[PDB]
Amino acid sequence: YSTLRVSSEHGVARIILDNPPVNVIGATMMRELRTVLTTLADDSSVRVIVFSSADPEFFLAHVDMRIGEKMDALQELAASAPADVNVFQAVGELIRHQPQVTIVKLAGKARGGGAEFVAAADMAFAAAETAGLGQIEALMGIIPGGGGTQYLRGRVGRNRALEVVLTADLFDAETAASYGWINRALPADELDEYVDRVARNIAALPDGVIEAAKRSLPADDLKEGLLGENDAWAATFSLPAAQQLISGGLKDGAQTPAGERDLEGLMRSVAREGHHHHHH
Amino acid sequence: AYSTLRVSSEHGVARIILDNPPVNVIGATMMRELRTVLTTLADDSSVRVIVFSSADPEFFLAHVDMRIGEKMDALQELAASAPADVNVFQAVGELIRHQPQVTIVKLAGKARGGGAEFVAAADMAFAAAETAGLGQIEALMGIIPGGGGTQYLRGRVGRNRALEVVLTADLFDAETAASYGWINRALPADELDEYVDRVARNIAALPDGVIEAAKRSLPADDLKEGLLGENDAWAATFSLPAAQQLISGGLKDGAQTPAGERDLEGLMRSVARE
Amino acid sequence: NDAYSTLRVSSEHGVARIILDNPPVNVIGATMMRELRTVLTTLADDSSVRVIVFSSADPEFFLAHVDMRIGEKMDALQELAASAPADVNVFQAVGELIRHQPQVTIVKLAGKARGGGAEFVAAADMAFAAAETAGLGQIEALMGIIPGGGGTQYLRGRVGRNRALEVVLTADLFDAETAASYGWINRALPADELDEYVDRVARNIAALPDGVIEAAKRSLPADDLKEGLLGENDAWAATFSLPAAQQLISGGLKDGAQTPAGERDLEGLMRSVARE
């Protein structure tokens, strides 16, 4: 795989996300994630999956801002998406319905679709000092269209969901945990051993226990919410701002490490600059 | 000009400053003015965000005016024009809950009863850690919250904590309210103004249609059955002898004065004991 | 004072106190389940009682977990089962009785509660715990099963599915601060203040005027958990039926479960049984 690596042993698969320079989620990663998770879902030797990043600053930056430039790659993904779920929601929805226990180890920054990925897993543990979660979408003239509005509604409640989405700020681990967006914030220097212990302890459970727990606690019914989000999100592309802001962002350094570090700041200054065409 | 509110706007943010001396009770006048101002603002394309704050240095909104039943005609007109299946008190929070703009409460001081209902109804509430307080005083006046509070709490904090807030009737500090999810965040008192201004400006700066899209994706909670159940529970308690005795006794012992409102919980417990 | 084997009940001024006392570690056995039903059914009909406070006589354990030998005397368990509510299993019947009680129910948690003990704590209207000393865990996964007394659904409602899965599958003992942050209990308080705190809340609620408690509960009715509880029963029943579960439980008893020394670190004890 070109955007990730997988290894498994002792009932735990580790999926390490590695797509330089900032771990954007592009069409290739979306396809490779589907392949790896679909294959694992049929592997009776694997009981737990742990997602981590190889990038020292970013878990998953956000969805590739150039993803709409090659609609054919996107059209192929959209054709394999489940009923009533859009091509972006299909990533989080695959994670949410995975048979294995899914665990995210979050050390760095995850925004937009990356933050959706984090919230979709069964459990997420984040480094107190270094981790960050933000829904950057509003600053690109859109809203989350990959399940984020609904994952937030369910985990943090509507009031805090609207705050996360509309302030579009980068939330630190301690705030994200107190909101319930992730399970726990832990010291950065303890996080790796903590997640390894949780994963191995869950994988050591007797046969059938994980299955029973997931049957007793089935995935939330989000069908109507995901449809509503899709409709609202689709409508934001019928307005000119989204493409102006996405183009302006790329011009000003989005999807480079310096540009992504304070993406919120970068996108607000792009909006303040307000460049656009003049066809007089 | 309004007699209980000051309204202004700039850079896409309307400020509504609550100003009804001596302790910022929600009376019939304020209820009428709020309907007018929020309905006017709902169709104002220049306004994206509404921030509520208080001109009183101790109280955000004390609670509903305990003398509001002395002038039944103004209250009855408001009741006659309330939305279907929403009582006249619930109509305050319900108007806030369905406002098109992002609604933000900046809570520096104490809010009880209907005041606490108002805080919980806004899209977001940020409170001063050292100075803010939230409580449902209703149980101490022999009733339960009848303006949406039971259902706002159920949604925000869960039934277990909602029963605790309602039946203990204690004044919660900002830190505990935020932990519970009753408000969004507790911030230092000397940072709250800047924090709220930054959030308000950032949301007002979002491009056309984003706020609308977010609210479409995150529609207001369906509370119809819960509000009707609260209404019937409230009417039943209000009809029993203790309610009017406690309300009259509280007024005689200094409720709705700043000295009485400071520790309203202790005052109302003492009224019941005496 | 000697009305019951596993409980002491007293009441005055509108507050009933139920002290849980079944040495050596406050296991929930068939006798406690029967006595709890008697006491709570009686109080439900007592207009003079407005608040029920549950606490423990055991300095280390609130309620350890359900008696690991409860299946050895099927007749006692059969009578309890035969008379459980429709769509509610015999273990769920304990939490469900507490959930539908007319009085305000309050748990004062100073020590450790696991399994059905944690389910009990979560079922009350409100639970206050000592920050320094209290602990809550769902041990069931380490015995080859899942919670079968409502705990999956009480966790789902109070902490959300994500944290419910974490609690159930890690099977660790959660401290009071973490449990409160998650919403599993109402609040963590200093150990030396907890008793006065709870007494104050109970007294204050009992002093409320006629009809207020009743109105509050009418406005905030118990969650509908019918389908969740049915699902939990089938998941629990299927795992419990397997030899692996039966050997883990047998080994736990062999290695000192249900003794104070074995119960202090039950998680470690049960992980050692499985490794052996």
Q: What is the DSSP string of C12-38?
A: ETTEEEEEE--TTTT-B-HHHHHHHHH
Q: What is the 3-state secondary structure (H, E, C) of A3-36?
A: CEEEEEECCEEEEEECCCCCCCECHHHHHHHHHH
Residue spans of alpha helices (H) in B1-58: 28-42
C-alpha distances in angstroms, A126 versus A51, A110, A151, A185?
Answer: 12, 11, 17, 5
CA C243, CA C257: separation in Å to the nearest integer?
A: 19
CA B75, CA C6: separation in Å to the nearest integer?
A: 56
Contact A215 C236 (CB under 8 A): no
Contact B234 C223 (CB under 8 A): no
Residue B145: exposure state from Cβ atoms within 10 A (0-12, 13-18, ≥19): buried
> For chain C, what is the domain count?
1
| Technique of determination | X-ray
Where is B187: in which H helix or E strand? Answer: strand B185-187
Where is B104: in which H helix or E strand? Answer: strand B102-107
Q: What is the CATH number of the domain that holds A14?
A: 3.90.226.10
Q: Are A252 and A270 in contact (CB under 8 A)?
A: yes
Q: Are C200 and C162 in contact (CB under 8 A)?
A: no
Classified as helix, coil or strand, B9 is strand
CA C5, CA C147: separation in Å to the nearest integer?
A: 26
Instruction: Calculate Rg over the CA atoms of chain A.
Output: 18
Other Cβ atoms within 10 Å of B192 Cβ, number: 24
The verdict on A122 touching C (C-beta cutoff 8 Å) is: yes
Q: Are C71 and C145 in contact (CB under 8 A)?
A: no
C-alpha distances in angstroms, C86 versus B186, C81, C182?
Answer: 45, 10, 31
Is cis: bond before C24, omega within 30 of 0? Answer: yes
| Residues of chain B positioned with their CB less than 8 A from the CB of A138 | 206, 210, 214
Decide the pairing of beta strands C7-12 and C15-20: antiparallel
| Residues of chain A positioned with their CB less than 8 A from the CB of C244 | 206-208
| Residues of chain C positioned with their CB less than 8 A from the CB of A219 | 161
Total residues found in chain B within this entry: 274
Q: Which of A158, A163, A239 sits opposite B209 (nearest CB)?
A: A239
Extract long-range pairs of C37-40: CB within 8 Å, 24+ residues apart.
C37/C80, C37/C93, C37/C97, C39/C4, C39/C7, C39/C9, C40/C97, C40/C98, C40/C101
| Residues of chain C positioned with their CB less than 8 A from the CB of A220 | 161
Structure tokens at B189: 């008192």
Q: What is the DSSP string of C203-246?
A: HHHHTS-TTHHHHHHHHSPPP--HHHHHHHHHHHHHHHTSHHHH
Classified as helix, coil or strand, C127 is strand
CA B75, CA B48: separation in Å to the nearest integer?
A: 30
Q: What is the DSSP string of A164-228?
A: HHHH---EEHHHHHHHTSSSEEE-HHHHHHHHHHHHHHHHTSPTTHHHHHHHHSPPP--HHHHHH
Distance from C152 to chain A by nearest Cα, in Å?
7
- Amino acid sitting at position A137: E
The verdict on A168 touching B (C-beta cutoff 8 Å) is: yes
Helices (H) and strands (E) in chain A, counts: 13, 10
Q: Which residues, listed in sequence order, are joined to residue C8 by a DSSP beta bridge? A: C19
Cβ within 8 Å of B, A 177-206 = 178
| Residues of chain C positioned with their CB less than 8 A from the CB of A217 | 152, 156, 161, 164-165, 168
Range of the domain at A70: 1-280
Structure tokens at C248: 């883990």
CA A78 to chain centroid, in Å, comes to 18
The verdict on B158 touching A (C-beta cutoff 8 Å) is: no
Q: Are A107 and A182 in contact (CB under 8 A)?
A: no
Distance from B213 to chain C by nearest Cα, in Å?
26
| Residues of chain C positioned with their CB less than 8 A from the CB of A180 | 160, 162-163
C-alpha neighbours within 13 Å on the C-beta side of residue A53 = 25
Classify B209 in phi/psi space as left (phi over 0), alpha (psi -120 to 50) or beta.
Answer: left
CA B117, CA B125: separation in Å to the nearest integer?
A: 12
Mutation target for C interface from B140, B150, B156, B160: give the one with most C CBs within 10 A: B160
Structure tokens at A106: 């979050």
Non-local (6+) Cβ contacts of B172 within 8 A are B133, B134, B135, B165, B180, B182
The verdict on C256 touching B (C-beta cutoff 8 Å) is: no
Contact C157 B162 (CB under 8 A): no
Which chain C residue has the Cα nearest residue A199?
C170
Tell which residue, C96, C77, C80, has the closest CA to residue C88: C96
Q: What is the DSSP string of B66-98?
A: TTGGGSHHHHHHHHHTSPTT--TTHHHHHHHHT
Q: What is the DSSP string of C180-201?
A: HHHTSSSEEE-TTTHHHHHHHH
Contact C239 A209 (CB under 8 A): yes
**Resolution of the deposited coordinates, in angstroms?**
1.8
